[PDB]
Design a protein around this ligand. Structure first.
Ligand SMILES: CCCCCCCCCCCCCCCCCC(=O)OC[C@H](COP(=O)([O-])OCC(O)COP(=O)([O-])OC[C@@H](COC(=O)CCCCCCCCCCCCCCCCC)OC(=O)CCCCCCCCCCCCCCCCC)OC(=O)CCCCCCCCCCCCCCCCC
Ligand SMILES: CCCCCCCCCCCCCCCCCC(=O)OC[C@H](COP(=O)([O-])OCC(O)COP(=O)([O-])OC[C@@H](COC(=O)CCCCCCCCCCCCCCCCC)OC(=O)CCCCCCCCCCCCCCCCC)OC(=O)CCCCCCCCCCCCCCCCC
Ligand SMILES: CCCCCCCCCCCCCCCCCC(=O)OC[C@H](COP(=O)([O-])OCC(O)COP(=O)([O-])OC[C@@H](COC(=O)CCCCCCCCCCCCCCCCC)OC(=O)CCCCCCCCCCCCCCCCC)OC(=O)CCCCCCCCCCCCCCCCC
Ligand SMILES: CCCCCCCCCCCCCCCCCC(=O)OC[C@H](COP(=O)([O-])OCC(O)COP(=O)([O-])OC[C@@H](COC(=O)CCCCCCCCCCCCCCCCC)OC(=O)CCCCCCCCCCCCCCCCC)OC(=O)CCCCCCCCCCCCCCCCC
Ligand SMILES: CCCCCCCCCCCCCCCCCC(=O)OC[C@H](COP(=O)([O-])OCC[N+](C)(C)C)OC(=O)CCCCCCCCCCCCCCCCC
Ligand SMILES: CCCCCCCCCCCCCCCCCC(=O)OC[C@H](COP(=O)([O-])OCC[N+](C)(C)C)OC(=O)CCCCCCCCCCCCCCCCC
Ligand SMILES: CCCCCCCCCCCCCCCCCC(=O)OC[C@H](COP(=O)(O)OCCN)OC(=O)CCCCCCCCCCCCCCCCC
Ligand SMILES: CCCCCCCCCCCCCCCCCC(=O)OC[C@H](COP(=O)(O)OCCN)OC(=O)CCCCCCCCCCCCCCCCC
Lengths: 35, 96, 206, 106, 57, 318, 243, 346
């Protein structure tokens, strides 16, 4: 998970499970899906 | 060339030979060996007429042997260490 | 393709005779290759001579053929094995596929650590005793007798022992032989053990 | 290497074939064992021309009571120890495959 | 590693014994395929010594 | 340990210079063939790297030696460029020893049983070695080119027949005196690294083994083994880069893999071969350094002990 | 080591290579013997040619010089017990070695007694001879040998007798003297041995003298004129007087 | 100060232990001159005896190859008488005596001297057996490795001298004797002619010296209970131990020497590459990893045993006689044995 993106952040709620530098959470900090 | 698909002489590693490794005489001896490896068969010098001795003009039988071999050879090249001779020879040692 | 990885073109690659005829990179996992079958014409002729009265078989005249090296164990492919074992967390279902290729096969790897494995008893004992200086720092050091009257007379008693040996009682005891002869001589400020004492000279005081 | 007469082997076992008798003679067995093996092979239908491996040790063709010829293979076995049993899929004696999961599908 | 049983742990029957013997002989031939024969080995051992002083008998 | 030193007698500058020159001369004469084999192995592996696997990973020094000897030059073929190597080594040793002794005398502690810390001694030694290597770089360049001539194709060879001949050819054909300092930076780096990566581990392990097994004679040689191994580990990449820079011919077409500097050579080496490519000929380098250090230490210790006994020092002070 | 040149070594290597390249497992032999009469083989496809009871006809217990060897054990035992020579401890103990080594020659003689052929058969094709013998303990050993590996010895047993012209059968067909034949390679109990001498005692009936002589001289017998006798008279492990 | 590496000399304070014995103390007799002298003497004698034995055996074989071997005691006596008078036998005796003088002085003497240098100080336990024998393993290994290649040049010179005699006059160097050949070869063919492809000889020498010296030293102390408690004959026990040591050395050394036959003498398969690529080291590795020992143990006695074992046995006996295996034993409760006498009787 270093310089190579294998997992899908779209299907992963949180990308912090494993160390990496190529993943970003779809629902970033400050993002709140609200009806 | 930079591409490694095909070999290039730039990476060739072969040291030039300027003379025989062990001398001209050694090279000549090697050539003589190559030419006459089997045709030249020197033999040690032994007297051809001894009074007491009996010339060895034939193969002797096994009954002339002073000692009995323990190991043996299979006809396929295998070397047998365990033989009936060993089986009979081990009885006194094991008993003792 | 790269000629640097080809032994035939690259002469700097040292071919291993003990692995001739075996290519771990070509294994199937599971291994499904047949490399052994009926072999004749080595010692047992393939033709028929049972009823041939004019032919007698001599097994001793076995022609030499190419050596058959023992099969080499499979060697791991790091990237392939890592990809195969890799599983996506919240994306993969927990199940085992029908295909048998998914079986986790064991493949040999680098052999460097096995040197330390073999040397482990030496390394472990060295760590236990020398590294930790167990039981003490003086057990494994080369032994040296204490200097003359060192650290104190009550413990050393070199001068008193020398006087006792040089006295009448000491000579009489040596004559009886129950007591062995003196083993050191008090030189000009230093004690020197005799060569027959079988001990090193005392270390210098600096 | 004392190969017995294939004609004599055929006479002792009438129904065996000349090729089978010759192959048995080529096989390195004493003449008595060659005759006995020929008898057993003919009586069972076993195909002597089979190179034994770690998957199957022999094969035979037998006509069952329904008139159909079926193939029967003799699996390589182990002495009460699957760990010692060689789980392979090649006609090879060497134990090449190493499995972390003995029962992949449980 | 190669199993010593060759797939026949028990010789419960003479047929099994024969099969094991045949495969064992074949394996031994394959393993010995790369060494010289008895005659060659014996002659080499007998005539290994080549250190003499006087020649030309 | 800060008072464990015993500097009760220090040789004069002239004595140091003469002893160092003689001992380094004999040591280089003895151990030159190993360096020759190492350089030839580096040249032959340049541009390809190590391609063997597991125990075969590397280049066999015995194989290289046998291939060199098969050329028909005998053992004298392993001494090609020996004159240039000896001259360069002598100049480097003279300059380094002079500078180091001058600085040490300037900054020495007053007490005889106290000595400069390993850090300060390493700094001084590295400065002296770098200065000496910068001054004497052309000799090393000539020697390395002479060694690599045999490995390289005939058309790429320089055909130097001596140190002065090579210097003149480099000055004239390539043009200017700047052509004589090619690879000087790499040589300076190698000298600094070797100077700083030898004295430390030796004393470290020597004191540790003395504490463990007390005072014995094998301690010095065990420490020498350890120091030689770690110095080789630290310095071999720099030696390889220096060899590549020296062997780089002026003409890029002649060059199999042109380089523009130390960094460029390192980048090319990393690209065309793994980091392990920095350690081709490690066994040869280790053997060379260990033999040189052992002979030098043995001869120097014997002579110094004899001189101390003549002076009249006590047994422990020696 | 190879760089050192030695013409004797070169000749040895050339001889080995030439032998390997020239001589093959298959060989051509013109020594074929055609018997005059038709051969009647047993139900097992074999013809009996020699029979004897060497253990019955040989001396086992009181044999010279083994009786002489074994008669000295009491002397050594008495010498050790009474120390008549006034020896030291180790010196007197040295006398106890003889009892532990005196019986070996008798063991070797008893072993050799099992190399006298008890039964001899010729198989179909006239190329294989089966020899059955027994040890003094009753163990039975049968071995098959190719006919070409036989080499008869002279009556004195000190030389190889001429294979072509050998006079060891009387006019009627029996043996003039106890015959000795050296087998170049003998496979006994699944183990091959080199140059093993076996003996046919004179006190043993010889069946089919022509076949016996042909096997002894190494000729390959032509068995084209053959008949089969279906007689199941011999049982497995059949008893005999060779015990 | 002199070069890149500095041999730092450091002073240390006093340290002493309760017991001053059973450790490492260099024997007074352990000196460069004395050890070298004893080793040279023992090696020279052993080499002379071994070479005489080998010459006699080889001449007997040569005579038997042309005449029938003895049939009785009288025939054997006359056979020996006729062997002794052979010109070839006399020339071989002379040349091999020179070879024995050379090798036993530079190889066996060196081995004995190095072993004594590295193992003289290992003291033994009073009224007991020397435990912690593992400490002696590094010393014996160091000596074996150091002295392993000291015989390869002499052996190669001997082989070259013997092989020159079997060439025609034109291609014959014409060496007057073994010493002349040894002096001429370095300047004619070069020093490397006496060392090229020396792995078989080097490994053979290493295994021989290690498993001989170490095993004899271990046994002579560990099995000493036979004559220390059982009152057995010490000389007979030492002879048995030496025999075991030499037999083990021959067993562990012959397989590595067998590589010569496999690589050079075994026939080559036409159209195929050499099995071992002509590498003695690779052949030795194959022998080490081979399943069957007999294959490379064939010819153990007819080839090497009687040419190596008697010399090693005589070397061990002479070394023991001179005192190259004598360790110093002192009481641990004696005056010099310990520094705490208050508890030696209490
Ligand atoms: C610090 C102390 C120092 C002490 C002094 C030391 C001095 C130096 C001594 C040096 C000795 C060198 C000996 C070299 C021998 C070389 C032989 C040779 O080439 O062999 C090649 C041989 C193969 O040769 P080949 O050409 O292939 O053979 C083909 C032939 O067709 C088949 O062969 P063949 O049948 O044609 O045979 C022909 C025959 C030649 O034909 C004859 O037999 C004619 C002669 C008849 C008379 C025989 C001897 C009569 C009495 C005198 C004995 C003097 C011995 C002197 C040497 C002793 C040390 C070995 O030659 C031989 O086979 C060998 C004959 C040698 C004598 C053997 C018997 C010795 C008995 C000793 C009894 C005790 C004597 C005490 C004396 C007092 C002082 C100690 O293979 C071997 O090497 C095998 C040898 C096996 C020997 C041992 C057998 C028994 C094993 C069981 C275990 C016993 C030992 C237990 C362990 C003990 C130790 C812990
Ligand atoms: C600087 C050292 C100075 C000297 C001192 C050194 C002392 C070392 C320990 C001494 C005792 C054991 C020595 C065993 C050496 C041989 C091991 C072996 O069989 O080869 C590996 C071998 C792989 O080769 P293979 O099985 O022949 O073929 C498969 C292929 O390699 C391909 O296989 P693959 O497809 O799976 O590919 C991956 C492969 C490729 O990688 C390699 O093969 C590289 C070379 C091997 C490296 C092994 C260690 C790596 C670092 C492990 C650190 C912990 C895990 C954290 C993540 C690390 C990520 C790198 O890596 C492995 O297979 C290695 C797995 C290692 C697992 C370690 C944890 C197991 C649990 C702990 C059990 C032992 C506890 C002992 C202490 C108990 C105290 C009460 O795997 C094993 O057999 C596993 C053995 C696991 C236990 C022993 C090794 C771990 C020792 C840890 C240190 C303990 C220190 C205790 C004393 C001091 C305390 C302060
Ligand atoms: C990503 C890296 C990560 C870290 C690991 C590092 C791994 C590195 C290798 C693998 C990666 C590839 C390389 C990347 C390098 C990156 C850094 C860089 O830029 O360095 C390149 C840099 C330069 O390499 P370059 O680009 O090849 O250029 C050099 C040329 O090849 C030289 O060409 P040349 O040989 O033809 O030179 C001829 C000579 C021609 O000579 C001249 O200079 C001619 C003009 C002056 C003539 C006069 C000289 C003085 C004499 C006269 C005095 C007055 C008169 C006196 C009285 C009369 C008598 C004399 O020229 C020179 O002297 C040198 C060139 C400069 C001349 C210009 C003027 C300079 C004045 C200042 C210096 C003066 C003293 C120099 C001598 C030394 C002291 C004795 O090299 C290095 O830094 C070496 C490697 C790094 C060393 C430091 C260690 C760093 C790592 C620490 C550990 C980290 C561990 C944790 C991980 C951290 C991860 C981040
Ligand atoms: C103890 C049991 C108590 C209860 C009763 C149970 C029933 C009895 C035991 C089971 C049956 C055992 C049968 C053994 C004989 C088999 C036939 C035969 O002659 O073998 C030759 C046969 C090779 O013949 P081949 O098949 O023709 O060779 C063709 C190829 O060359 C292929 O060859 P290769 O690649 O296989 O290499 C063969 C090579 C490699 O062989 C090995 O390396 C195998 C392992 C050897 C070391 C372990 C054994 C002990 C070594 C001595 C220790 C010092 C103290 C000894 C005395 C007290 C302790 C017993 O070996 C040799 O060249 C010769 C080996 C020695 C043959 C000895 C002949 C007499 C056997 C009868 C018993 C003798 C007892 C006296 C003491 C032992 C004398 C050796 O090799 C074997 O069968 C290997 C075994 C050899 C004998 C040792 C095994 C039995 C004793 C095990 C004791 C374990 C604990 C020891 C602890 C010691 C602490 C100090
Ligand atoms: C991202 C990368 C950035 C790179 C640039 C910026 C960072 C640079 C970092 C440099 C670090 C240098 C470390 C040196 C090694 C120190 C090791 C150490 O402390 O070990 C402990 C030991 C401690 O020693 P000690 O003296 O305390 O005593 C040891 C004994 N005991 C433990 C008992 C006390 O130090 C050493 O052994 C050091 C030996 C080497 C000293 C010399 C170092 C190099 C000096 C170079 C000077 C200039 C040369 C000429 C240059 C010409 C061109 C300008
Ligand atoms: C851990 C934190 C650090 C940062 C992260 C890691 C980045 C760096 C990673 C480096 C990986 C290792 C690279 C070298 C691999 C060599 C492999 C090999 O053995 O190749 C075969 C070579 C071949 O050598 P050869 O050519 O002599 O061949 C002989 C071998 N036969 C006979 C089989 C051919 O073997 C060796 O050289 C063995 C010794 C290797 C020593 C490697 C030392 C690397 C040190 C690099 C940094 C400098 C030292 C710093 C520390 C000490 C000083 C302070
Ligand atoms: C099964 C394995 C264990 C076998 C038993 C070992 C028992 C002793 C412990 C040794 C452990 C390491 C193996 C070394 C074996 C050879 C050396 C040896 O045994 O040392 C003993 C000897 C000194 O002992 P001695 O003085 O005779 O003791 C009685 C004194 N009254 O010393 C000498 O002769 C001098 C030897 C100098 C060189 C020794 C090198 C040892 C290195 C060990 C590994 C160190 C690892 C360190 C790792 C550090 C990591 C940061
Ligand atoms: C040492 C004990 C620890 C080691 C392991 C022991 C294993 C024991 C297994 C049983 C079989 C072996 C015999 C017993 C051990 C050896 C003998 C022994 O213990 O020594 C004492 C013994 C008797 O002496 P004792 O009478 O008690 O002394 C009193 C003096 N007033 O003294 C004697 O009589 C000496 C007998 C020696 C026999 C040694 C045999 C084993 C050694 C290997 C084989 C050696 C073969 C060659 C022997 C040549 C002898 C000349």
């Amino acid at each position: 998970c270093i310089y190579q993106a294998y997992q899908n952040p779209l299907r992963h709620i949180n990308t912090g499970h494993n160390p990496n530098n190529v993943y970003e959470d779809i629902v970033m900090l400050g993002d709140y899906p609200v009806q | 060339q930079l591409d490694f698909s095909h070999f290039d002489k730039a990476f060739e590693n072969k040291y030039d030979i300027v003379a025989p490794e062990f001398g001209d005489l050694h090279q000549k001896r090697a050539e003589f060996i190559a030419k006459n490896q089997g045709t030249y068969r020197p033999v040690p010098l032994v007297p051809n007429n001894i009074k007491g001795l009996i010339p060895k003009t034939c193969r002797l039988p096994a009954t002339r042997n002073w000692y009995r071999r323990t190991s043996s050879f299979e006809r396929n090249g295998f070397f047998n260490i365990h033989t009936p001779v060993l089986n009979t020879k081990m009885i006194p040692w094991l008993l003792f | 393709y790269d000629w640097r990885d080809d032994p035939k073109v690259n002469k700097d690659i040292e071919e291993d005779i003990r692995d001739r005829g075996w290519h771990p990179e070509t294994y199937d996992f599971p291994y499904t290759k047949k490399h052994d079958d009926w072999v004749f014409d080595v010692t047992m002729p393939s033709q028929n001579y049972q009823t041939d009265l004019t032919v007698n078989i001599h097994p001793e005249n076995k022609k030499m053929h190419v050596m058959k090296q023992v099969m080499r164990q499979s060697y791991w492919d790091a990237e392939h094995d890592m990809a195969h074992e890799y599983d996506y967390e919240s994306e993969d279902l927990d199940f085992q596929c029908e295909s048998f290729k998914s079986q986790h096969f064991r493949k040999k790897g680098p052999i460097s650590q096995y040197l330390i494995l073999g040397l482990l008893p030496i390394l472990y004992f060295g760590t236990e005793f020398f590294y930790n200086h167990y039981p003490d720092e003086d057990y494994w050091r080369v032994a040296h007798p204490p200097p003359l009257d060192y650290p104190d007379t009550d413990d050393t008693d070199d001068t008193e022992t020398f006087k006792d040996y040089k006295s009448f009682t000491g000579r009489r005891m040596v004559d009886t032989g129950i007591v062995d002869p003196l083993w050191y001589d008090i030189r000009e400020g230093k004690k020197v053990y005799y060569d027959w004492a079988g001990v090193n000279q005392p270390m210098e005081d600096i | 290497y004392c190969q017995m007469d294939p004609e004599e082997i055929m006479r002792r076992v009438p129904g065996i074939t000349r090729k089978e008798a010759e192959f048995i003679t080529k096989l390195g067995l004493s003449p008595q064992e060659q005759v006995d093996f020929a008898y057993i092979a003919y009586n069972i239908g076993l195909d002597i021309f089979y190179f034994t491996n770690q998957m199957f040790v022999a094969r035979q063709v037998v006509t069952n009571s329904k008139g159909e010829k079926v193939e029967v293979l003799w699996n390589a076995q182990c002495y009460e120890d699957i760990a010692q049993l060689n789980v392979g899929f090649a006609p090879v004696l060497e134990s090449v495959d190493y499995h972390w999961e003995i029962f992949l599908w449980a | 590693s190669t199993s010593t049983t060759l797939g026949l742990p028990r010789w419960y029957k003479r047929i099994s014994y024969y099969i094991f013997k045949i495969r064992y002989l074949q394996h031994t031939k394959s393993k010995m395929n790369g060494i010289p024969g008895s005659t060659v080995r014996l002659m080499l051992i007998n005539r290994h010594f080549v250190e003499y002083e006087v020649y030309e008998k | 340990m800060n008072y464990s030193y015993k500097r009760y007698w220090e040789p004069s500058t002239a004595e140091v210079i003469g002893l160092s020159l003689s001992v380094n001369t004999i040591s280089a004469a003895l151990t030159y063939p190993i360096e020759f084999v190492k350089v030839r192995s580096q040249i032959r592996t340049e541009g390809v790297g190590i391609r063997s696997k597991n125990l075969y990973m590397g280049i066999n020094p015995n194989k290289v030696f046998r291939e060199i000897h098969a050329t028909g030059n005998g053992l004298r073929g392993f001494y090609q460029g020996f004159e240039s190597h000896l001259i360069g080594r002598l100049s480097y040793l003279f300059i380094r020893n002079l500078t180091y002794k001058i600085i040490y005398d300037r900054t020495k502690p007053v007490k005889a049983h106290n000595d400069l810390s390993h850090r300060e001694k390493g700094v001084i030694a590295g400065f002296a070695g770098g200065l000496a290597a910068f001054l004497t770089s052309p000799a090393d360049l000539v020697n390395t080119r002479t060694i690599a001539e045999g490995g390289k194709p005939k058309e790429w060879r320089w055909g130097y027949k001596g140190l002065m001949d090579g210097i003149n050819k480099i000055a004239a054909t390539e043009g200017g005196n700047a052509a004589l300092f090619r690879g000087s930076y790499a040589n300076v780096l190698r000298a600094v690294i070797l100077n700083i990566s030898l004295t430390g581990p030796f004393d470290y392990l020597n004191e540790k083994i003395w504490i463990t097994f007390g005072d014995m004679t094998w301690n010095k040689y065990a420490a020498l083994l350890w120091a030689s191994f770690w110095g080789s580990v630290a310095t071999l990449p720099f030696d390889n880069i220096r060899t590549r820079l020296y062997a780089q011919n002026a003409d890029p077409t002649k060059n199999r893999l042109t380089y523009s500097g130390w960094a460029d050579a390192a980048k090319k080496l990393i690209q065309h071969e793994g980091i392990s490519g920095f350690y081709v000929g490690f066994y040869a380098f280790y053997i060379r350094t260990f033999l040189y250090a052992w002979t030098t230490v043995f001869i120097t210790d014997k002579i110094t002990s004899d001189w101390k006994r003549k002076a009249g020092l006590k047994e422990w002070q020696i | 080591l190879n760089h050192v040149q030695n013409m004797l070594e070169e000749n040895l290597k050339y001889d080995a290579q030439k032998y390997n390249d020239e001589v093959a497992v298959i060989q051509k032999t013109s020594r074929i013997y055609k018997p005059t009469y038709t051969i009647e083989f047993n139900r097992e496809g074999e013809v009996l040619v020699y029979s004897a009871d060497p253990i019955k006809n040989s001396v086992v217990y009181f044999k010279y010089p083994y009786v002489l060897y074994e008669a000295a054990i009491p002397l050594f035992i008495w010498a050790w017990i009474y120390n008549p020579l006034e020896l030291s401890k180790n010196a007197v103990n040295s006398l106890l070695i003889y009892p532990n080594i005196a019986w070996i020659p008798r063991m070797w003689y008893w072993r050799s007694l099992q190399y006298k052929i008890q039964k001899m058969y010729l198989l179909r094709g006239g190329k294989v001879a089966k020899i059955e013998t027994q040890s003094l303990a009753g163990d039975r050993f049968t071995s098959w040998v190719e006919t070409y590996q036989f080499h008869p010895l002279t009556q004195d047993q000190k030389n190889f007798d001429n294979q072509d012209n050998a006079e060891f059968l009387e006019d009627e067909g029996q043996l003039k003297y106890e015959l000795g034949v050296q087998l170049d390679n003998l496979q006994e109990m699944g183990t091959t041995s080199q140059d093993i001498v076996i003996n046919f005692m004179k006190e043993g009936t010889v069946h089919h003298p022509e076949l016996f002589e042909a096997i002894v001289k190494g000729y390959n017998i032509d068995t084209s004129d053959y008949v089969i006798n279906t007689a199941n008279n011999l049982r497995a492990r059949e008893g005999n007087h060779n015990h | 100060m002199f070069f890149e590496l500095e041999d730092i000399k450091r002073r240390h304070s006093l340290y002493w232990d309760i017991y001053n014995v059973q450790g490492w103390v260099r024997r007074p007799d352990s000196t460069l001159y004395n050890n070298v002298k004893r080793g040279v003497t023992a090696g020279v004698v052993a080499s002379l005896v071994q070479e005489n034995i080998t010459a006699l055996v080889e001449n007997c074989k040569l005579l038997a190859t042309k005449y029938e071997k003895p049939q009785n005691l009288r025939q054997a006596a006359t056979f020996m008488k006729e062997v002794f008078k052979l010109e070839n036998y006399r020339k071989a005796v002379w040349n091999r005596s020179q070879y024995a003088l050379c090798i036993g002085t530079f190889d066996i003497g060196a081995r004995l001297a190095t072993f004594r240098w590295l193992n003289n100080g290992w003291q033994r336990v009073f009224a007991g057996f020397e435990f912690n024998f593992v400490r002696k393993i590094p010393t014996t290994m160091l000596a074996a490795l150091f002295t392993a290649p000291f015989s390869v040049p002499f052996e190669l010179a001997r082989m070259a001298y013997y092989g020159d005699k079997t060439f025609p006059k034109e291609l014959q160097r014409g060496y007057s004797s073994y010493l002349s050949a040894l002096a001429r070869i370095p300047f004619e063919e070069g020093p490397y002619f006496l060392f090229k492809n020396s792995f078989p000889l080097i490994i053979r020498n290493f295994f021989q010296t290690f498993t001989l010296f170490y095993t004899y030293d271990f046994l002579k102390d560990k099995a000493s209970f036979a004559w220390r408690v059982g009152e057995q004959n010490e000389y007979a026990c030492k002879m048995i131990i030496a025999g075991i040591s030499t037999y083990l050395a021959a067993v562990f050394s012959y397989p590595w020497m067998v590589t010569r036959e496999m690589v050079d003498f075994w026939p080559k398969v036409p159209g195929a590459p050499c099995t071992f690529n002509g590498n003695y080291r690779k052949a030795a590795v194959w022998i080490w990893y081979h399943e069957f020992s007999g294959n490379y143990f064939a010819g153990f006695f007819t080839k090497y045993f009687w040419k190596a074992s008697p010399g090693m046995f005589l070397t061990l006996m002479l070394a023991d006689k001179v005192g190259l295996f004598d360790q110093t034993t002192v009481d641990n409760f004696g005056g010099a044995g310990n520094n705490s006498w208050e508890d030696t009787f209490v």
